[PDB]
Amino acid sequence: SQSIIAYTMSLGAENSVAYSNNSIAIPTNFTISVTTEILP
Amino acid sequence: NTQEVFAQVKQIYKTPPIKDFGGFNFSQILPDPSKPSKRSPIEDLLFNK
Amino acid sequence: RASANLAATKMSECVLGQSKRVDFCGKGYHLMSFPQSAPHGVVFLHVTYVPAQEKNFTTAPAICHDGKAHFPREGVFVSNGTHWFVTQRNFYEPQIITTDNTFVSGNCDVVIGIVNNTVYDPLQPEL
Amino acid sequence: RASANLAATKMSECVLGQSKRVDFCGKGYHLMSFPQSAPHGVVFLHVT
Amino acid sequence: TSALLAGTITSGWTFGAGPALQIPFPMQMAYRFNGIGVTQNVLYENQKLIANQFNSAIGKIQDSLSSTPSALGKLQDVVNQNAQALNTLVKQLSSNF
Amino acid sequence: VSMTKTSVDCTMYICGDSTECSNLLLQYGSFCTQLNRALTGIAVEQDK
Ligand SMILES: *[C@@H]1O[C@H](CO)[C@@H](O[C@@H]2O[C@H](CO)[C@@H](O)[C@H](O)[C@H]2NC(C)=O)[C@H](O)[C@H]1NC(C)=O
Ligand SMILES: *[C@@H]1O[C@H](CO)[C@@H](O)[C@H](O)[C@H]1NC(C)=O
Ligand SMILES: *[C@@H]1O[C@H](CO)[C@@H](O)[C@H](O)[C@H]1NC(C)=O
Ligand SMILES: *[C@@H]1O[C@H](CO)[C@@H](O)[C@H](O)[C@H]1NC(C)=O
Ligand SMILES: *[C@@H]1O[C@H](CO)[C@@H](O)[C@H](O)[C@H]1NC(C)=O
């Protein structure tokens, strides 16, 4: 069964992060990615 | 306009427990859990005014 | 005309240099931008640095040695076990704590959150 | 639209990083900026 | 706005680029003093003074934004001129031409 | 950065020395009232 549906907004995924006060995260590895910006 | 000014990042982040932010007191700007709205105290003053 | 002035600003600060402006020239830390022509427009190739594969470590604001606080000249004081290391903020390159990359100012009692460890010197073992 | 693009630039580099641009993100040396909502607008807290 | 504030005060500025690396806050602020040419030791030496100054500045900006005459006229002018445009249109429709 | 301030009088533009200035006014002067509001806004904008 396929039909038109109405849903509330998906504001985003819930990201769980812990501030603490004696913990740091540092990126071990990195990625390079090119993105296209189109301007008339 | 409001989409590109307000949703530059589309990753929602929960409010951390307000404890030991180095003495920096983020009660005014962060939304208090006293009300079910996600509005802060100065945000409420701006919306009322 | 507003979009054309925006594109000439991006042609000037993304292609002809490197922009420290976040999100102006790419989703991430900007590295380059390659212009490409288009019908009544310009398409940009915004190459950016994007880090990943993060790790969580325990840090301290400074190091106490011989009654003096030692501060990172660059990077962050990091730890996993017992050994304390200094590394730059954007990439994990663990370096042993030495006076060449550590800056000293004041004593160790004025600052909160200090941990104590051996700060190595490069000069005494040769001498 | 012009004011909205200005505000999204200030969301883009006054809130999401640190600005070396003088007076653009606050009077003095900018540290951070805390965004705050408003009726049909955005109110900034440019701490410097 | 709450998500932006949580990313700002918990991750620092790495949430814009990459995947929101956490950072103790006194250390993000020292790292943001490092961007204005002052060394981080000044902050770590005067953390209580900086925290008290920031708390007082937030209190002062709340008292200023709670006096009624707030510099909120630029936001009020948009709604006022839109309502003026609409009511001018219906008073125009009142005319006989 | 600035442009010369300008303003228009409704009577001296469209009325002039017309005897039925009232007949021109009650039917068509609200347009010029809007136009004077726009011109006053432009002058204030150039000062700011
Ligand atoms: C944290 O990472 C360092 C990076 O090498 C590890 O250092 C080792 O420490 C042990 C002592 O416990 C030495 O015997 C080794 O020679 C060191 N190097 C290596 C490559 O093993 C350290 O073990 C790590 N700590 C934890 C808890 O994982
Ligand atoms: C880092 O780069 C890519 C991950 O995108 C992977 O192929 C490579 O092996 C990684 N290197 C290390 C040391 O993790
Ligand atoms: C933050 O500020 C509020 C209001 O001034 C205060 O009640 C609260 O105790 C402060 N936070 C801490 C951890 O003291
Ligand atoms: C972090 O908070 C804990 C309390 O949970 C405290 O014991 C510790 O001293 C704090 N460390 C710093 C660096 O503020
Ligand atoms: C290291 O710093 C701590 C601060 O908690 C202090 O108690 C300790 O005495 C210091 N180390 C030495 C060897 O004095």
Short mmCIF file of C-alpha atoms and ligand atoms in Angstrom, two decimals:
data_model
loop_
_atom_site.label_atom_id
_atom_site.label_comp_id
_atom_site.label_asym_id
_atom_site.label_seq_id
_atom_site.Cartn_x
_atom_site.Cartn_y
_atom_site.Cartn_z
CA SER A 1 0.00 0.00 0.00
CA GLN A 2 1.51 3.28 -1.23
CA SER A 3 -0.02 6.68 -0.50
CA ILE A 4 0.75 10.28 0.38
CA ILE A 5 1.69 10.69 4.05
CA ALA A 6 2.42 13.67 6.27
CA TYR A 7 5.17 13.55 8.87
CA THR A 8 6.71 15.98 11.29
CA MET A 9 10.06 17.55 10.47
CA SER A 10 13.27 15.52 10.83
CA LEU A 11 15.36 18.11 12.63
CA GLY A 12 18.39 15.81 12.64
CA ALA A 13 20.05 12.80 14.19
CA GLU A 14 20.65 12.91 17.95
CA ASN A 15 24.41 13.11 18.55
CA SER A 16 25.50 12.03 22.05
CA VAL A 17 28.75 13.71 23.17
CA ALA A 18 30.28 13.92 26.66
CA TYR A 19 31.94 17.20 27.63
CA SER A 20 33.65 15.88 30.82
CA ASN A 21 36.62 18.15 31.64
CA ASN A 22 39.65 15.89 31.37
CA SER A 23 39.11 14.27 27.98
CA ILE A 24 40.14 15.23 24.47
CA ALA A 25 39.53 13.63 21.10
CA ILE A 26 42.12 14.06 18.36
CA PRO A 27 41.67 12.79 14.79
CA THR A 28 43.94 9.82 14.16
CA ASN A 29 43.22 9.76 10.41
CA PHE A 30 41.79 12.21 7.90
CA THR A 31 39.88 12.34 4.63
CA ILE A 32 40.08 14.68 1.63
CA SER A 33 36.81 15.39 -0.16
CA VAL A 34 36.02 17.90 -2.91
CA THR A 35 32.61 19.60 -2.97
CA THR A 36 31.02 21.52 -5.86
CA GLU A 37 29.59 25.01 -5.35
CA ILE A 38 27.46 26.32 -8.24
CA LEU A 39 27.07 30.12 -8.47
CA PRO A 40 25.17 31.90 -11.29
CA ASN B 1 16.33 32.25 4.14
CA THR B 2 15.58 30.85 7.57
CA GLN B 3 16.66 27.38 6.43
CA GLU B 4 20.12 28.53 5.35
CA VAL B 5 20.62 30.78 8.36
CA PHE B 6 19.50 28.22 10.97
CA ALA B 7 20.37 24.76 9.58
CA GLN B 8 23.97 25.07 8.41
CA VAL B 9 24.73 21.95 10.49
CA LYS B 10 21.99 19.31 10.51
CA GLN B 11 23.38 17.35 13.48
CA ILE B 12 21.36 17.99 16.61
CA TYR B 13 23.34 17.95 19.84
CA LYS B 14 21.88 17.38 23.27
CA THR B 15 22.49 19.84 26.04
CA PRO B 16 25.33 18.57 28.24
CA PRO B 17 24.74 18.51 31.99
CA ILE B 18 25.61 21.99 33.19
CA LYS B 19 28.50 21.15 35.49
CA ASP B 20 32.07 22.40 35.74
CA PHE B 21 32.29 24.45 32.56
CA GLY B 22 35.43 25.98 34.01
CA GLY B 23 33.36 28.41 36.07
CA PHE B 24 31.65 29.75 32.93
CA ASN B 25 27.93 29.92 33.71
CA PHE B 26 25.79 28.97 30.74
CA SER B 27 22.32 29.18 32.37
CA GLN B 28 21.15 32.26 30.49
CA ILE B 29 21.86 31.11 26.93
CA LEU B 30 21.23 27.37 27.23
CA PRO B 31 17.57 26.22 27.32
CA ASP B 32 16.60 25.30 30.86
CA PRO B 33 14.70 22.00 31.28
CA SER B 34 12.16 23.68 33.58
CA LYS B 35 9.85 24.32 30.62
CA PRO B 36 9.13 21.81 27.81
CA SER B 37 10.11 24.50 25.28
CA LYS B 38 13.72 24.69 24.13
CA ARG B 39 13.77 28.43 24.81
CA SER B 40 16.41 30.08 26.98
CA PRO B 41 15.83 32.86 29.49
CA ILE B 42 17.15 35.70 27.30
CA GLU B 43 15.45 34.01 24.33
CA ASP B 44 12.17 34.32 26.26
CA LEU B 45 12.86 37.99 26.92
CA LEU B 46 13.51 38.55 23.21
CA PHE B 47 10.33 36.72 22.19
CA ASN B 48 8.23 38.61 24.71
CA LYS B 49 9.68 42.01 23.87
CA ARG C 1 24.68 40.89 -9.42
CA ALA C 2 24.72 39.89 -5.76
CA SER C 3 25.49 36.29 -6.73
CA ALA C 4 28.15 37.51 -9.18
CA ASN C 5 29.87 39.55 -6.47
CA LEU C 6 29.74 36.49 -4.21
CA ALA C 7 31.30 34.35 -6.94
CA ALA C 8 34.06 36.88 -7.59
CA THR C 9 34.80 36.97 -3.86
CA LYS C 10 35.05 33.17 -3.86
CA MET C 11 37.21 33.38 -7.00
CA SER C 12 39.47 35.78 -5.15
CA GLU C 13 39.71 34.09 -1.75
CA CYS C 14 39.32 30.40 -2.65
CA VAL C 15 41.15 30.00 -5.99
CA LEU C 16 43.76 32.75 -5.51
CA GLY C 17 44.65 31.82 -1.95
CA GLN C 18 43.53 29.87 1.07
CA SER C 19 40.63 30.98 3.21
CA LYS C 20 40.61 30.71 6.98
CA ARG C 21 36.93 31.60 6.79
CA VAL C 22 34.96 28.54 7.87
CA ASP C 23 32.23 27.28 5.52
CA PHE C 24 33.01 30.04 3.02
CA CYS C 25 35.12 27.86 0.70
CA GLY C 26 34.03 24.33 1.48
CA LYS C 27 32.50 22.09 4.16
CA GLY C 28 35.64 21.63 6.22
CA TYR C 29 39.09 23.14 6.51
CA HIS C 30 39.78 24.65 3.11
CA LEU C 31 42.78 23.56 1.07
CA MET C 32 42.18 24.66 -2.55
CA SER C 33 39.44 25.51 -5.01
CA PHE C 34 39.39 24.73 -8.72
CA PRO C 35 37.22 27.02 -10.88
CA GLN C 36 35.16 25.48 -13.66
CA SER C 37 33.22 27.42 -16.27
CA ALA C 38 29.50 26.86 -16.73
CA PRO C 39 26.63 28.32 -18.78
CA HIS C 40 25.96 31.66 -17.07
CA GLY C 41 27.76 30.60 -13.92
CA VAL C 42 30.87 29.24 -12.24
CA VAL C 43 31.15 25.81 -10.61
CA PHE C 44 33.76 25.50 -7.87
CA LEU C 45 35.81 22.47 -6.81
CA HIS C 46 36.34 23.10 -3.09
CA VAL C 47 38.84 20.54 -1.79
CA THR C 48 38.91 20.51 2.00
CA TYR C 49 40.55 18.72 4.90
CA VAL C 50 38.11 16.47 6.76
CA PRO C 51 39.48 14.46 9.71
CA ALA C 52 38.01 11.21 10.96
CA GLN C 53 38.65 8.08 13.03
CA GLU C 54 38.70 10.00 16.24
CA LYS C 55 40.18 8.75 19.56
CA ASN C 56 39.48 9.90 23.13
CA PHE C 57 42.34 10.72 25.40
CA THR C 58 42.78 12.39 28.76
CA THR C 59 44.38 15.84 28.80
CA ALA C 60 45.67 18.35 31.31
CA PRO C 61 46.13 22.13 31.02
CA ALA C 62 49.78 22.05 32.14
CA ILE C 63 52.59 19.96 33.63
CA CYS C 64 54.27 20.53 37.01
CA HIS C 65 57.99 19.82 37.24
CA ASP C 66 60.51 21.24 39.72
CA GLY C 67 57.78 23.51 41.07
CA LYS C 68 57.13 25.20 37.71
CA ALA C 69 54.14 24.86 35.40
CA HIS C 70 54.92 23.80 31.84
CA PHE C 71 52.58 24.79 29.05
CA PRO C 72 52.27 23.41 25.50
CA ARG C 73 54.08 25.66 23.05
CA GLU C 74 51.96 24.00 20.37
CA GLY C 75 49.38 21.26 20.49
CA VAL C 76 47.71 19.43 23.37
CA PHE C 77 49.01 17.54 26.40
CA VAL C 78 47.62 14.01 25.89
CA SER C 79 47.63 10.68 27.75
CA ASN C 80 46.21 7.21 27.54
CA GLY C 81 48.10 5.25 30.20
CA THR C 82 50.84 6.78 32.31
CA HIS C 83 53.03 8.32 29.62
CA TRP C 84 52.16 11.95 28.85
CA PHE C 85 52.60 13.27 25.30
CA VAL C 86 52.24 16.50 23.34
CA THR C 87 50.60 16.48 19.91
CA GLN C 88 49.03 19.01 17.58
CA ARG C 89 45.30 19.54 17.88
CA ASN C 90 44.25 18.44 14.39
CA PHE C 91 46.28 15.22 14.06
CA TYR C 92 47.56 12.55 16.45
CA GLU C 93 51.38 12.67 16.39
CA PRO C 94 52.48 11.66 19.91
CA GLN C 95 55.67 13.46 20.96
CA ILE C 96 57.46 13.05 24.28
CA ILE C 97 57.31 16.01 26.65
CA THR C 98 60.48 18.06 26.18
CA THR C 99 61.45 21.65 26.93
CA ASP C 100 61.69 22.49 23.22
CA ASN C 101 57.93 22.10 22.70
CA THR C 102 56.91 23.12 26.25
CA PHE C 103 56.56 26.71 27.46
CA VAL C 104 57.12 27.58 31.13
CA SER C 105 55.37 30.38 33.03
CA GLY C 106 54.62 30.67 36.72
CA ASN C 107 54.38 27.86 39.22
CA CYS C 108 52.14 24.79 39.29
CA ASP C 109 49.80 25.82 42.15
CA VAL C 110 48.07 28.80 40.50
CA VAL C 111 46.40 26.73 37.74
CA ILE C 112 43.73 24.08 38.44
CA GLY C 113 43.68 20.70 36.75
CA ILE C 114 47.45 20.25 36.63
CA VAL C 115 48.97 16.76 36.40
CA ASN C 116 52.54 15.94 37.37
CA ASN C 117 55.04 14.19 35.14
CA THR C 118 58.66 14.22 34.05
CA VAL C 119 59.37 17.02 31.57
CA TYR C 120 62.41 15.94 29.63
CA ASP C 121 65.25 18.21 28.66
CA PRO C 122 67.38 17.66 25.52
CA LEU C 123 70.63 19.09 26.98
CA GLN C 124 71.57 17.06 30.10
CA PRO C 125 72.14 13.59 28.52
CA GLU C 126 74.75 14.90 26.05
CA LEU C 127 76.50 16.84 28.83
CA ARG D 1 17.67 38.26 1.59
CA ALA D 2 20.74 40.47 1.96
CA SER D 3 20.36 40.61 5.74
CA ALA D 4 19.69 36.85 5.87
CA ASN D 5 22.88 36.09 3.94
CA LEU D 6 24.81 38.40 6.28
CA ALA D 7 23.35 36.57 9.28
CA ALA D 8 24.14 33.16 7.80
CA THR D 9 27.73 34.27 7.23
CA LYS D 10 27.91 35.31 10.88
CA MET D 11 26.44 31.94 11.84
CA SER D 12 29.02 30.42 9.55
CA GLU D 13 32.17 31.95 10.97
CA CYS D 14 31.31 33.78 14.21
CA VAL D 15 29.48 30.84 15.86
CA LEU D 16 31.11 27.90 14.03
CA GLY D 17 34.67 29.09 14.51
CA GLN D 18 36.69 32.19 15.27
CA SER D 19 36.92 35.29 13.13
CA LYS D 20 40.13 37.16 12.46
CA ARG D 21 38.04 39.84 10.79
CA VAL D 22 38.03 42.91 13.02
CA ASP D 23 34.66 44.38 14.06
CA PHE D 24 32.81 41.90 11.86
CA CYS D 25 31.97 39.55 14.76
CA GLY D 26 31.97 42.03 17.62
CA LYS D 27 33.70 45.17 18.95
CA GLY D 28 37.22 44.03 19.82
CA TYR D 29 39.05 40.70 19.58
CA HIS D 30 36.38 38.07 18.98
CA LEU D 31 36.38 34.90 21.10
CA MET D 32 33.08 33.17 20.27
CA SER D 33 29.46 34.00 19.49
CA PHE D 34 26.37 32.42 21.02
CA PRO D 35 23.38 32.37 18.62
CA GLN D 36 19.95 33.23 19.97
CA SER D 37 16.59 32.98 18.23
CA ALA D 38 14.26 35.92 17.70
CA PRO D 39 10.92 36.62 16.01
CA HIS D 40 11.90 36.62 12.33
CA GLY D 41 15.54 37.18 13.18
CA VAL D 42 18.67 35.98 14.95
CA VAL D 43 20.21 37.77 17.93
CA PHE D 44 23.95 37.30 18.42
CA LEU D 45 26.00 37.36 21.63
CA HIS D 46 29.39 38.47 20.31
CA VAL D 47 31.69 38.10 23.31
CA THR D 48 35.06 39.76 22.70
CA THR E 1 19.88 27.22 18.27
CA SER E 2 20.22 24.84 21.22
CA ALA E 3 22.08 22.35 19.03
CA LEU E 4 24.44 25.10 17.85
CA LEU E 5 25.08 26.17 21.45
CA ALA E 6 25.70 22.58 22.58
CA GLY E 7 28.19 22.05 19.76
CA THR E 8 29.87 25.36 20.55
CA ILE E 9 30.25 24.80 24.30
CA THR E 10 31.05 21.07 24.16
CA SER E 11 32.96 20.44 20.92
CA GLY E 12 34.50 23.88 20.47
CA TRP E 13 34.54 24.76 16.80
CA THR E 14 35.29 21.30 15.46
CA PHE E 15 31.57 20.62 15.05
CA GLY E 16 31.47 22.80 11.94
CA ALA E 17 34.20 20.79 10.21
CA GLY E 18 34.64 17.10 10.94
CA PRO E 19 32.81 15.24 13.72
CA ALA E 20 32.53 17.44 16.84
CA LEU E 21 35.67 16.57 18.76
CA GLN E 22 35.01 17.21 22.44
CA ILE E 23 37.40 19.54 24.43
CA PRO E 24 37.36 20.58 28.05
CA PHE E 25 35.93 24.23 27.93
CA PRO E 26 38.65 26.09 29.83
CA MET E 27 40.92 24.60 27.03
CA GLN E 28 38.73 25.66 24.18
CA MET E 29 38.76 29.24 25.56
CA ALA E 30 42.45 29.18 26.04
CA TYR E 31 42.70 27.94 22.46
CA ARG E 32 40.53 30.89 21.47
CA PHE E 33 42.81 33.25 23.35
CA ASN E 34 45.57 31.71 21.27
CA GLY E 35 43.83 33.07 18.17
CA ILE E 36 43.93 36.70 19.31
CA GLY E 37 47.68 36.70 19.94
CA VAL E 38 47.57 36.20 23.72
CA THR E 39 49.22 33.09 25.08
CA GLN E 40 47.10 30.43 26.78
CA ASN E 41 48.94 30.80 30.08
CA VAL E 42 47.20 34.12 30.69
CA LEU E 43 43.81 32.40 30.66
CA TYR E 44 44.93 29.44 32.74
CA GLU E 45 46.46 31.88 35.25
CA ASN E 46 43.30 34.00 35.41
CA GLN E 47 40.51 31.48 34.84
CA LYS E 48 38.43 32.65 37.80
CA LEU E 49 38.67 36.27 36.64
CA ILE E 50 37.68 35.32 33.09
CA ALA E 51 34.73 33.24 34.32
CA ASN E 52 33.53 36.06 36.59
CA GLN E 53 33.90 38.62 33.79
CA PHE E 54 31.94 36.42 31.38
CA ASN E 55 29.19 35.82 33.95
CA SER E 56 28.94 39.56 34.61
CA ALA E 57 28.82 40.31 30.88
CA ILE E 58 25.99 37.80 30.39
CA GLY E 59 24.11 39.35 33.31
CA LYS E 60 24.61 42.85 31.91
CA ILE E 61 23.43 41.86 28.44
CA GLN E 62 20.36 40.29 30.01
CA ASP E 63 19.61 43.42 32.02
CA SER E 64 20.08 45.55 28.90
CA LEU E 65 17.79 43.18 26.96
CA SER E 66 15.17 43.44 29.74
CA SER E 67 14.67 47.22 30.01
CA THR E 68 11.83 47.46 27.36
CA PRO E 69 13.71 50.10 25.18
CA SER E 70 15.83 47.32 23.67
CA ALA E 71 17.67 47.85 20.56
CA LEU E 72 15.12 45.58 18.88
CA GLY E 73 13.75 48.25 16.58
CA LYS E 74 15.38 46.79 13.49
CA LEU E 75 13.47 43.55 14.03
CA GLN E 76 10.27 45.44 14.87
CA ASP E 77 10.50 47.58 11.71
CA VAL E 78 10.06 44.57 9.40
CA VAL E 79 6.75 43.53 10.94
CA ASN E 80 5.61 47.14 11.29
CA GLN E 81 6.25 47.97 7.63
CA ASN E 82 4.67 44.73 6.42
CA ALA E 83 1.51 45.47 8.43
CA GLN E 84 1.59 49.05 7.14
CA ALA E 85 1.83 47.71 3.57
CA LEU E 86 -1.17 45.41 4.04
CA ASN E 87 -3.37 48.03 5.69
CA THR E 88 -2.36 50.59 3.07
CA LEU E 89 -3.44 48.08 0.44
CA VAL E 90 -6.90 47.65 1.97
CA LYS E 91 -7.29 51.43 2.43
CA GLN E 92 -6.33 51.69 -1.24
CA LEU E 93 -9.13 49.26 -2.05
CA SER E 94 -11.42 51.66 -0.19
CA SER E 95 -10.89 54.33 -2.90
CA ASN E 96 -13.09 54.90 -5.97
CA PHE E 97 -10.38 55.77 -8.56
CA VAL F 1 28.57 55.23 -0.29
CA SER F 2 25.80 57.85 -0.61
CA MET F 3 23.25 59.18 -3.09
CA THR F 4 21.65 62.60 -3.36
CA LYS F 5 18.54 62.92 -1.23
CA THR F 6 15.37 63.61 -3.22
CA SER F 7 11.71 64.19 -2.38
CA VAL F 8 8.55 65.06 -4.29
CA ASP F 9 5.48 67.14 -3.44
CA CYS F 10 2.22 65.59 -4.63
CA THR F 11 0.43 68.87 -5.25
CA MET F 12 3.24 70.52 -7.18
CA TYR F 13 3.81 67.44 -9.27
CA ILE F 14 0.37 66.21 -10.29
CA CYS F 15 -1.86 68.98 -8.93
CA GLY F 16 0.19 72.02 -9.82
CA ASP F 17 -2.20 74.95 -10.23
CA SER F 18 -5.27 72.79 -10.87
CA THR F 19 -8.56 74.07 -9.51
CA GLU F 20 -9.85 70.57 -8.70
CA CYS F 21 -6.90 69.72 -6.51
CA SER F 22 -9.36 68.07 -4.11
CA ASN F 23 -10.79 65.92 -6.87
CA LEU F 24 -7.30 64.84 -7.81
CA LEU F 25 -6.51 64.26 -4.15
CA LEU F 26 -9.25 62.13 -2.69
CA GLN F 27 -9.05 59.64 -5.57
CA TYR F 28 -5.31 59.50 -6.34
CA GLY F 29 -3.22 61.01 -3.51
CA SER F 30 -2.78 57.84 -1.49
CA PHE F 31 -0.44 56.47 -4.15
CA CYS F 32 1.69 59.61 -3.83
CA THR F 33 1.54 59.26 -0.03
CA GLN F 34 3.12 55.83 -0.45
CA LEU F 35 5.64 57.32 -2.88
CA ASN F 36 6.63 60.03 -0.38
CA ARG F 37 7.05 57.34 2.27
CA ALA F 38 9.39 55.44 -0.06
CA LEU F 39 11.38 58.58 -0.89
CA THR F 40 11.70 59.51 2.80
CA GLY F 41 12.94 56.00 3.52
CA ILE F 42 15.53 56.35 0.76
CA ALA F 43 16.76 59.65 2.24
CA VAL F 44 17.01 58.16 5.74
CA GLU F 45 18.82 55.16 4.26
CA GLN F 46 21.40 57.40 2.59
CA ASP F 47 22.08 59.21 5.85
CA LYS F 48 22.51 55.93 7.70
C1 LIG G 1 49.63 4.77 25.11
O1 LIG G 1 50.32 4.87 23.88
C2 LIG G 1 51.75 4.72 24.04
C3 LIG G 1 52.36 4.93 22.67
O2 LIG G 1 53.45 4.06 22.45
C4 LIG G 1 52.11 3.37 24.66
O3 LIG G 1 53.50 3.43 24.97
C5 LIG G 1 54.10 2.18 25.38
O4 LIG G 1 54.23 2.14 26.80
C6 LIG G 1 54.79 0.93 27.31
C7 LIG G 1 54.75 1.02 28.82
O5 LIG G 1 53.47 0.68 29.33
C8 LIG G 1 56.20 0.75 26.76
O6 LIG G 1 56.74 -0.48 27.23
C9 LIG G 1 56.17 0.76 25.24
O7 LIG G 1 57.50 0.70 24.73
C10 LIG G 1 55.48 2.02 24.72
N1 LIG G 1 55.38 2.00 23.27
C11 LIG G 1 54.73 1.06 22.57
C12 LIG G 1 54.76 1.23 21.08
O8 LIG G 1 54.13 0.13 23.10
C13 LIG G 1 51.28 3.08 25.91
O9 LIG G 1 51.39 1.72 26.31
C14 LIG G 1 49.81 3.36 25.66
N2 LIG G 1 49.04 3.16 26.88
C15 LIG G 1 47.91 2.44 26.91
C16 LIG G 1 47.24 2.33 28.25
O10 LIG G 1 47.45 1.90 25.91
C1 LIG G 2 43.74 6.64 6.73
O1 LIG G 2 43.13 6.85 5.39
C2 LIG G 2 42.21 5.88 4.86
C3 LIG G 2 40.89 6.09 5.58
O2 LIG G 2 39.98 6.82 4.77
C4 LIG G 2 42.74 4.46 4.98
O3 LIG G 2 42.76 3.85 3.69
C5 LIG G 2 44.14 4.47 5.56
O4 LIG G 2 44.62 3.14 5.73
C6 LIG G 2 44.12 5.17 6.91
N1 LIG G 2 45.40 5.04 7.58
C7 LIG G 2 45.52 4.74 8.88
C8 LIG G 2 46.92 4.65 9.40
O5 LIG G 2 44.54 4.55 9.59
C1 LIG G 3 24.84 29.19 36.77
O1 LIG G 3 24.02 30.38 36.96
C2 LIG G 3 22.81 30.20 37.70
C3 LIG G 3 22.12 31.55 37.73
O2 LIG G 3 23.04 32.59 38.04
C4 LIG G 3 23.13 29.68 39.09
O3 LIG G 3 21.92 29.47 39.81
C5 LIG G 3 23.90 28.37 38.96
O4 LIG G 3 24.24 27.89 40.26
C6 LIG G 3 25.17 28.57 38.14
N1 LIG G 3 25.87 27.31 37.97
C7 LIG G 3 26.69 26.79 38.91
C8 LIG G 3 27.32 25.48 38.57
O5 LIG G 3 26.90 27.37 39.97
C1 LIG G 4 36.73 17.66 36.54
O1 LIG G 4 35.58 17.45 37.36
C2 LIG G 4 35.84 16.57 38.47
C3 LIG G 4 34.52 16.36 39.18
O2 LIG G 4 33.73 15.38 38.52
C4 LIG G 4 36.91 17.17 39.38
O3 LIG G 4 37.22 16.25 40.42
C5 LIG G 4 38.17 17.48 38.58
O4 LIG G 4 39.11 18.17 39.39
C6 LIG G 4 37.82 18.33 37.36
N1 LIG G 4 39.01 18.58 36.55
C7 LIG G 4 39.28 19.77 36.01
C8 LIG G 4 40.54 19.85 35.20
O5 LIG G 4 38.55 20.74 36.17
C1 LIG G 5 51.98 17.71 41.52
O1 LIG G 5 50.85 18.57 41.59
C2 LIG G 5 49.99 18.21 42.69
C3 LIG G 5 48.75 19.06 42.60
O2 LIG G 5 47.58 18.32 42.94
C4 LIG G 5 50.73 18.34 44.03
O3 LIG G 5 49.89 17.82 45.05
C5 LIG G 5 52.02 17.54 44.01
O4 LIG G 5 52.75 17.77 45.21
C6 LIG G 5 52.85 17.88 42.77
N1 LIG G 5 54.02 17.03 42.69
C7 LIG G 5 55.10 17.16 43.47
C8 LIG G 5 56.19 16.16 43.26
O5 LIG G 5 55.19 18.05 44.32
#
